Chains A and B, each alone.
Chain A
Amino acid sequence: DAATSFLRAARSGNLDKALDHLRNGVDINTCNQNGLNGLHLASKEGHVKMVVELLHKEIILETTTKKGNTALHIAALAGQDEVVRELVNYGANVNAQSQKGFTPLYMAAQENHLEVVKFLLENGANQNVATEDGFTPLAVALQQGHENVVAHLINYGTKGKVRLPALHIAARNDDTRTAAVLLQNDPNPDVLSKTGFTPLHIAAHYENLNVAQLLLNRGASVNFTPQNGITPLHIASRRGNVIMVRLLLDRGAQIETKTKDELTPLHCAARNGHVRISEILLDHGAPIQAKTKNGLSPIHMAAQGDHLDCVRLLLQYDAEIDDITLDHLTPLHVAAHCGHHRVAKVLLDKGAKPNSRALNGFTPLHIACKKNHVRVMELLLKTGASIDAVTESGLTPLHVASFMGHLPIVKNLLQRGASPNVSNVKVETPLHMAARAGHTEVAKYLLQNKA
């Protein structure tokens, strides 16, 4: 008699009475004479909160009635879009077949439930699944005159699962109850999305610590490496999630893992300016001289992003201040190219060579004069950079500044005694460079000084 009262409460949406009956000791999987349990009766009447509560009580999601219908079948036939969404989010099989072969997509299509049809198709429902009589959702929608359902079924076709797996959605929302139900149903915590990432990647992206710990306790791979090589530790380091980085390192994340571009987590932390993550990785044994495919070290990444404190921290941990990429670009070269005069000042104060040579003989002063970065030029000239230095083609900083038309840099160089009479390998002077690029003001100022 108590089970009958519980079923009546489930049908009527009286959640308090159903919870009281469950507390008293009524079996959660009890059902009426037709086989409809509390989940079925709640799904028929659109009681979403009752469905969620019963799913939290470890009710069997894939229970079938005497007609072979699951809860998803009943919710699709009854036209309850919210209940269909809730059941799908908790792991309901959208391709389940009843005794006569009906699918939830078929039941939604035959009753002109367009929203349910759209949601099921987006969640991977196969419209090619036919009943025992050979009919399809398209066929029954055509038979019943449901023009919109027919149109949507024809247009969608076989676009496939465009939604994320339910565990990924639970990890994005930090939903521990939904994730627990999903992992109870499907034991595998490393389900893959179309992109190839596990739900642990999603948890590390949003720093959802609760669901991340839940996944790791169920057997998720802390060093799951997709084709691109992006581990959850990489994502946590890039995103700035300090607590997630600590959690992943505690559970056994590998710190020397390289992506397809050979970026270590130290690179990801350094290029985004996360000082605390970089310090944690370095204290756990991160290689500070790791190089990417282009030869960039983490200090190159930190200088590239104008991350001053990250450069300071890396230099404190015995980073090479004159490490060179494949193009022989020092971090000072990168700072001069990007105009980061604060990074350049920090590098120069700790002994970075101001006259370092790249592949084409370019100094940081040459790059500063090329990119109209006056402050970097001033700092370099204060720190002993050669104002008359030449490249492999004989280009002085005045040559580059005059060719690029950067008039203030030309004026500053000429005020400090730079000679406009210098010549290239083509014997061309800065006046030649100014005349070949049509910079009238630069040419006039060059003429007014010594030419």
Chain B
Amino acid sequence: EELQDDYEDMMEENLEQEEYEDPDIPESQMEE
């Protein structure tokens, strides 16, 4: 192969659009 970087999906995975977002605020309430 060695040419997956020419495709839209692999390039989108490489660019890592999720790394530019704020995921959430970790609260972790102790109450059950």
Measured CB to CB, the residues of A under 8 A from B are 122, 161-164, 168-169, 172, 193-195, 197, 201-202, 205, 228-230, 234-235, 238, 259-263, 268, 292-296, 325-327, 329, 337, 360, 370, 393, 395, 400, 403-404
Contact = CB atoms under 8 A, between A and B. Distances in A.
Given A164-B8, A360-B29, 4 more contacts: A163-B6, A169-B5, A201-B15, A337-B28
Contacts of B20: 228-230, 234, 238, 259, 261, 263, 268
Which of the listed residues B17, B22, B24 has the most CB atoms from chain A within 10 Å of its own CB?
Answer: B22
Given A163-B8, A164-B6, A169-B6, A195 B21 contact: no
Contacts of B9: 162
A404 B32 CA distance: 11
A164 B10 CA distance: 10
B25 A329 contact: yes
B21 to A, nearest CB: 4
Contacts of A260: 21
A58 B9 CA distance: 32
A392 B6 CA distance: 55
Contacts of A337: 26, 28
B19 A261 contact: no
A30 B6 CA distance: 33
Nearest to A173: B5
Interface residues of B, number: 22
A182 B27 CA distance: 51
Interface residues of A, dominant DSSP: loop
B22 A194 contact: no
Given A228-B20, A263-B21, A235 B15 contact: yes
A309 B4 CA distance: 36
Contacts of A230: 17, 20
Given A162-B7, A169-B6, A360-B29, A292 B14 contact: no
Given A162-B9, A195-B12, A326 B19 contact: no
Contact of B8 (A162, A229, A261, A325): A162
Which of the listed residues B5, B7, B25 has the most CB atoms from chain A within 10 Å of its own CB?
Answer: B25
A337 B7 CA distance: 39
B6 to A, nearest CB: 5
Contacts of A326: 25
Nearest to A295: B25
The 5 closest A-B pairs by CB, nearest first: A261-B21, A261-B22, A292-B22, A194-B8, A294-B25
B19 A327 contact: no
A76 to B, nearest CB: 19
A221 B5 CA distance: 23
A124 to B, nearest CB: 11
A194 B31 CA distance: 45
A263 B12 contact: no
A296 B22 contact: yes
Contacts of B6: 163-164, 169, 172
24 contacts: A122-B7, A162-B7, A164-B6, A164-B7, A164-B11, A168-B11, A169-B5, A172-B6, A193-B8, A195-B11, A195-B17, A229-B20, A230-B17, A234-B20, A235-B15, A261-B21, A262-B22, A263-B21, A268-B19, A295-B25, A326-B25, A337-B26, A370-B30, A393-B31
B14 A205 contact: yes
A293 B22 CA distance: 8
Contacts of B24: 294
B5 to A, nearest CB: 6
A259 B28 contact: no
Contacts of B31: 393
A205 B17 CA distance: 12
A261 B25 CA distance: 13
